[PDB]
Design a protein around this ligand. Structure first.
Ligand SMILES: CC(C)(COP(=O)(O)OP(=O)(O)OC[C@H]1O[C@@H](n2cnc3c(N)ncnc32)[C@H](O)[C@@H]1OP(=O)(O)O)[C@@H](O)C(=O)NCCC(=O)NCCS
Ligand SMILES: CC(C)(COP(=O)(O)OP(=O)(O)OC[C@H]1O[C@@H](n2cnc3c(N)ncnc32)[C@H](O)[C@@H]1OP(=O)(O)O)[C@@H](O)C(=O)NCCC(=O)NCCS
Ligand SMILES: O=C([O-])C(=O)[O-]
Ligand SMILES: O=C([O-])C(=O)[O-]
Ligand SMILES: O=C([O-])C(=O)[O-]
Ligand SMILES: O=C([O-])C(=O)[O-]
Ligand SMILES: O=C([O-])C(=O)[O-]
Ligand SMILES: O=C([O-])C(=O)[O-]
Ligand SMILES: [Mg+2]
Ligand SMILES: [Mg+2]
Ligand SMILES: [Mg+2]
Ligand SMILES: [Mg+2]
Ligand SMILES: [Mg+2]
Ligand SMILES: [Mg+2]
Lengths: 313, 314, 314, 313, 313, 314
């Protein structure tokens, strides 16, 4: 009979991805302005190169200065022969600098449980001192259909990402784009077109599932790194719906993610003014008052606190 | 089973006018309004130190004022507070039979409603209350919307379910301090042009689906900007389109707007009756489908037209 | 488990042409159409008094007409009617093996499909029918959408699921008499100007997710205004974008429109093949990600490309 | 927030079965002392005779005087080609004297829902004035595993029987007997054998499921009609666990079922004395007191009423 | 991925019940050898005396020296008008000496949740320093049918009792006795009768539900307080199945319960010998060995520890 | 649906002979026994310090020894231990194709099995293993029996489920240090005389029901007192009566006992065939029920008789 479980307090404004098969770029990633680093063994690495990428990543975890980055590795999916070797090698060979693993293409709670079972055993066997957190990608029809059970699937779970590329493919969406506006998704009214959000339910359901269970909801990749305004629009929708951050799949997207997912000065100012107004009303024996011609009440305090919390971390 | 979905309560619910229990001067004004439902508030419009006085005010008003034919409801405090049980005990022990309903806020699962039901049922039996209260709830949290159907099925007392956009936004972590309505940062970019979309679509549609499945009235909640009448119309129109049957007024100005939108227009009713006539005429010719104004109407159109008619003849 | 989602039926389902069984004159025209699937109707396009005769007409048509390579389906009456059992018994006892499929309307739970499955299975065994029927259902009620996934997993016979916007709107209590498409009162107001949004988004997306999870074909239902080609294109395009693989035609003119929208454009197919080419080249360079026209493409892009190509090459 | 829903108040001490293919038995069954009559289309009727059995039963429903007896027909199972014809013909051809149908081999709630769907449609189409009630047999591993959902499967459902023959076969029990003691089910203690109840859970779980949902739990066939004392033991176990009656598969078993499932005057006497004792205790301001060296309290009232209710039936 | 959650470590060998309407007995109860005291507001107290009993109990909680007894109160059920008054008065008026509340006739998890909602609110409102634990009674068809969900229903939940009197009534069992042997529940073999356990499933299922979720399973009242040997048999059965204690409804039953539910010196000796034997085997590089002509292995260690654990508390 | 329960594996499973992997001298003796299934143990018969060596021994034994036609299984360590993952990896990366099965102990939910399935499936694919392993599990905890049905349905690989009375007793908190069999303190008192009852009844029956529902073989576990032949026979006889198809042998002597009890006697088979013959004759007379030795036999009796004959003809 308390409120929502609090999610992890750590910053998660941007998760910068890089293929494990390009170790020369690891230093640049560590030096970036991204909160989270995702070294990839999955869909940015060709099958013949996954063994080498695995070796590269283990070496980088043990050898590089990762500063204050939250260090995550995306392993291969449970429908592949690679996943078990990813987990075993990482947990048997990588030092304690590794923070987290990301599980792709999650379709049910049991998927997460399976990884948890293996990871827990190796951590115990090898006497690992820093237990890994988990993050997952909802990027299939099964994933979104079972989104709440997945959100509740492990005490290790800290974050859940939408993967619009795999999601579109799994859903059979007629597009080769990764996130963003869809040309053929619009409303016709009086001869004019009005574009609508083809991702609404997927993103909102993920947010609801995450907040219910104390997980961070995160927006995934936006493919068009040549389109800053397009990225801003996608990030803005996500931030509005309750997602706390977004992937960067290109160095330029890091600043854009940090821009959108850090509340503006004006937003923070209004938030504090609402808090001040409600405190004043409280002293007058009132639980509701008027702010700029609109209603504010006790619920507004919680809303204002959402803004301030994201700005103060 | 093997019948159509359960019919919801047939009472009017176009507008629910809210007022803080700590401002008893508003009570007679609320009683005089054109609102179908009255919600005397003990929760989020009332500061903590004023909750006891508000409870006393409300009980006295339930017993003392002429409430006409309005459906009288009280929003109690949430189950995550120390206030809720005293709200329920005092109301059920001291309020007369003019009280019709209580509103449970921040409902996260069916068991929340069951808990209030258990308490209310016991006191009604102990006091020999002749008019059993109905319940209404607010879906205004991540847990709430995630568990929306089980909540809709949670009690025989349950008559209505409202979306609470303010608490919903806070719960979901939505980057906004507004209450319902258009969100500036929720738009589609297309060829340099912005196209605003509905950031509340799923939540509202899911509430409607859960309610209609289990014979509950789906209702839209507060719209914060009482200076923005067209914004209210837009929000109310979206809700009415999705299947919600009414909307809160948190200011007297909003009652007229709610009644305007949630009462089907003459034009809409006229078309509905024309469609009903068209289908009856088609039925006589041995047809279950026909053409009306260049479009298809069939047996399903009868049910749709009856949705328009029903809300108008109430 | 530990495989990709089950593959849906490989058959074309770009358009399902509907016609009332009480109008046998339409039958040969439907057989001559360009529709992938034919739906002979016993339900909401047929008046109650004509349903018995419509049943007889349809049985004659199944046994007598040249249906070519059309997938032949019959929409029976709902389980909340006295007609449904006579539809199924007569069809399965009297129709020959040309019948491919039965469509069940107004499905609200998995048990509805199980019930029809139980009866159909018994008759097929009793009469030694050589070609067991496939099933398709309509999600067209609040209960249907609330229980969409369990319905999608309800039978090994199930091949397709349609959204029925007319009955869905009526069931949801949506204030409209239109069938699908833009709703005048569903828009966002931003700085004094309106921006229309999709009032069907969740229902459509949830149906697609349910279907793709369980190897079913998600299909868009009727668009009422057969006088509005561009409106049809808009609706069909939204559906195609979300992952639905076809759309009903309730008028001959809509068949060409459906085939057009649900067959990927040459431009779209061209880009897909270019992406596939780019990704193979990247593989050879020891890369699982590369750049295509200023955009990221990776291993997932291969799957997206294959969605386009697969649908174009059928 | 009330007590468990009340089951049907009609007597169900004994259900007398007879094959539909042996219509000479019908008038004898109608003249018996059995509360319920079950005319059989299923496992007592060979496949080639089922169509004629169906015709015989319809004739008997419409032509015989069944007095005050509750008239039921056991149809064929949902895994057979026969069931649909059974239901269609019964509801389209039989008059309103038919009270009930028994569905065999029920494995899940959806099985009962399927029959309900068909039955409801025909009753509406033909304007039948007396809607049928349902009863089912739990006689498979799936049946007992899903016993509660089956008990809640239909507002038509009035009774649930255990079918020990099919249950044994389904469970793979090493026996060819029908109910009763099993020679190989005993406890060995210091060289002595003590026979135990191999049907305990199945019977108890059926009672629990039924009472939870307002259904009558009933014991099924006892095969050895040459063994009166064996029948008595089986019937007594069932009555003790809470089952309200038992099948008769031979005329001799009817009197035995009525004997066991009608509470003895001794039992009724004790119950009334306990009831009187509790009333006297309440007058003294006591909720508990002593009866024959035993504790009795407010719970004892409910127990005594269980006895009396079945006696005044 | 650990062992099942440990139940509360406190002793619970005997729960001595007494009606709240007889406060003259409270001192005798406090001085008894019972681990837990249950002051009753329910079925041992007549309806008209429930108000006075409530006041009596609140006074006794605040006034009596309860030593080290675990102090619990059985409130009225959720299907009565009394329950809310019991809870409100107890939590608003009784001091911090109260340890626990017993909820009778529980039929689902939501029942426990309902009481938890009320209790939690009052504790917060009144600033109660010691949060109450909960215990419940499984004593209805719905209760046993939903026994696992009930066991998982609240973090407060510490114990679950079988209530054989209400259970028998709810199930429609033909008896007026409370627990123990049932005359009509026996197996007939070669003209000889062999009595079996009519309570087996109910008791075993309660134990399983409790041990799964870290709850103590407890046996309920035995009615015939004139029958020491009958009590011993009932207690021995419960102890064998895994119940950790039993109600006393008469002073004489306290010593009996303590006798049976404290492992005998012989039993403890064998346990320690098995532990010693297994330690010796481990030193020889063995995980299994022979003890008194039988197999003992790693599992035997856990079994021996069950014995020792109960003896050492 | 609409078919009888799924058939379990047809292979013999009358006895599963266990032996610790840390005693390789036993291996050839086990291979020469009359047991249908062999269980090489890495778990509770092997001390923690000896588990690595046991693993090496067993892998070498799988590849090196002639196991004839016996079904070869290995019991791995539990998912609550650090050993289990190394057990599975080494077995699947190093053992040849002679390995048939692995046994998972202390299973508490379906997800436990799914977890092992996930790991096993990946290694089989990575190594191109030609014969996919089957799974068997042990129900030997409170959670295990509480969730027995979901566990039985947890994997397509699952072929058998055993009751583990030692761990079950410990988990349930049973006051005993014995393994299976009569419990001295579990009896009914009646008129001064004691009558011992089955303290394992529900656990065994529920396991049988879960298995038969989902086409799994239910098996009885270890009986600890190998000095007590009649105790074993009694325990095995109870299990065979409830529907379990075999039993563990934890000592060579027990193999003969298990085969004795779990092979139907000639008397039992003769009666079964006589009943089948009687029912055949009844069918010819136009009867579905008749009399056999003063008792009723009908169509259900045919299935019962077939249960006896089937176990005899393995
Ligand atoms: C999109 C991508 C393929 C483009 O690669 P590219 O053609 O070499 O990119 P650019 O030329 O525009 O890179 C600009 C600079 O940033 C570096 N850079 C490229 N990708 C980087 C990354 N992911 N992280 C950090 N630095 C990166 C480049 O090496 C180059 O450095 P320089 O200035 O010293 O020359 C590349 O950014 C990439 O691999 N993306 C991440 C893919 C991934 O991990 N996807 C996850 C699944 S969606
Ligand atoms: C109980 C146990 C420790 C007794 O060992 P023991 O003292 O050597 O047994 P015995 O001396 O009576 O054995 C008799 C003979 O059978 C052999 N034997 C013992 N256990 C055997 C087994 N499990 N399989 C095959 N042969 C076995 C012995 O080697 C000996 O053979 P021999 O005549 O050539 O000398 C041993 O049987 C054992 O480990 N059992 C299996 C334990 C197990 O796997 N349990 C896990 C599941 S609960
Ligand atoms: O994982 C991804 O990059 C995706 O599918 O969106
Ligand atoms: O209940 C409310 O006012 C809200 O939070 O929207
Ligand atoms: O089935 C239909 O035509 C509908 O309701 O949309
Ligand atoms: O139905 C029956 O007779 C049975 O199988 O017990
Ligand atoms: O609570 C009790 O005493 C009972 O019903 O057994
Ligand atoms: O696994 C075992 O041997 C047991 O616990 O019975
Ligand atoms: Mg992906
Ligand atoms: Mg609110
Ligand atoms: Mg329709
Ligand atoms: Mg049978
Ligand atoms: Mg009781
Ligand atoms: Mg074990």
């Amino acid at each position: 009979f308390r409120l929502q479980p609090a999610p992890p307090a750590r910053p998660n404004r941007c998760q910068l991805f890089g293929p494990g098969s390009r170790p020369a770029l690891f230093e640049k990633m560590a030096a970036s302005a991204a909160d989270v680093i995702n070294l990839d063994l999955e869909d940015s690495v060709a099958p013949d190169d996954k063994a080498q990428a695995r070796a590269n990543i283990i070496e980088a975890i043990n050898g590089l200065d990762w500063g204050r980055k939250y260090l995550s590795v995306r392993i291969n999916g449970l429908d592949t022969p690679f996943w078990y070797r990813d987990v075993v090698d990482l947990l048997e060979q990588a030092g304690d600098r590794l923070d987290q693993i990301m599980i792709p293409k999650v379709g049910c709670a049991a998927d997460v449980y399976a990884v948890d079972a293996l990871v827990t055993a190796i951590e115990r066997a090898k006497g690992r001192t820093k237990p890994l957190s988990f993050e997952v990608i909802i990027e299939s029809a099964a994933g979104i259909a079972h989104v709440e059970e997945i959100a509740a699937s492990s005490p290790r779970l800290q974050a859940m990402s939408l993967g619009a590329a795999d999601f579109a493919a799994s859903m059979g969406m007629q597009t080769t784009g990764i996130g963003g506006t869809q040309e053929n998704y619009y409303m016709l009214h009086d001869g004019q077109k009005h574009w609508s959000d083809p991702w609404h339910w997927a993103q909102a359901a993920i947010v609801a599932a995450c907040r219910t269970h104390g997980i961070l909801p995160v927006d995934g990749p936006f493919g068009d790194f040549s389109d800053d305004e397009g990225f801003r629009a996608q990030a803005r929708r996500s931030a509005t719906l309750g997602m706390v951050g977004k992937w960067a799949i290109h160095p330029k997207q890091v600043a854009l993610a940090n821009e959108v997912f850090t509340p503006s000065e004006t937003a923070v100012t209004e938030a504090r003014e609402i808090l001040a107004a409600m405190d004043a009303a409280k002293a007058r024996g009132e639980g509701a008052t008027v702010y700029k011609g609109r209603l504010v009440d006790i619920a507004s305090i919680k809303q204002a606190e959402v803004i301030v919390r994201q700005a103060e971390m």
